[PDB]
Amino acid sequence: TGRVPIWLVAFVGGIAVIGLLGLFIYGSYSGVGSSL
Amino acid sequence: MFTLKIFVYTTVIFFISLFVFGFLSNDPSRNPNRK
């Protein structure tokens, strides 16, 4: 129909916010700066 | 020193029995718009 819904563009942009913040909590328990 | 414990517990029960028997005496009818 030539259109994306408004709630869909906030959904797949909403998972990536949880996705980027999910890697920021994992990266605080691993790698440099994680007391390991 | 016991006489203060008799006097405080007179006063604490007096305002508690005014509290319990006050809210038991039809408190949701003390509004406006009827009675």
Partner: protein, 52 residues
């Protein structure tokens, strides 16, 4: 595990007391009638005598 079980059981039952203050307020205001606001045709303050 005591320091999680006691700390989170200030987090839940303090908030569970706050919603009691929300709902003891709202249920007695809905049963009386003024849960959507003050009635503009007769507000009860204007039919009272003033303070002094």
């Amino acid at each position: 595990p005591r320091s999680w079980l006691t700390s989170s059981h200030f987090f839940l039952p303090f908030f569970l007391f706050i919603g009691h203050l929300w709902h003891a307020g709202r249920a007695r205001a809905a049963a009386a009638g003024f849960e959507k606001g003050i009635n503009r045709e007769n507000e009860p303050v204007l039919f009272m005598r003033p303070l002094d």
